[PDB]
Design a protein around this ligand. Sequence first.
Ligand SMILES: *C(=O)/C=C/c1ccc(O)cc1
Length: 121
Amino acid sequence: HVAFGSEDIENTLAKMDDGQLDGLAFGAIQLDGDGNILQYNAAEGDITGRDPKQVIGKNFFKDVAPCTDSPEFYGKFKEGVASGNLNTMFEYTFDYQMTPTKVKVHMKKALDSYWVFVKRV
Ligand SMILES: *C(=O)/C=C/c1ccc(O)cc1
């Protein structure tokens, strides 16, 4: 088990393959520094209606999740990629090609890549 917001979440998830990541209680996306989607788990698709196989390779901020292109989300992502120590938590609403859904988001650098964790609120 691993809880959303755990202090060493990136350690636990570093040791995980697809099945384990797909088993998480919360949405988990891994992005590269350009915002391209490396991994996208089953729990996230249950929040957003996206097929996890279909969004791998796409750009999260440009194409998949346009509502996240804002100082409040994308702005914080690039600040944390630049500053080297991404680790930030905030509320957000996801509303593109889905019913508007309130979530909380935790972005954290991976053990060169970057996690976006999501849970319904
Ligand atoms: C806003 O358009 C957000 C879209 C979105 C957020 C998270 C996802 O996993 C997919 C789309």
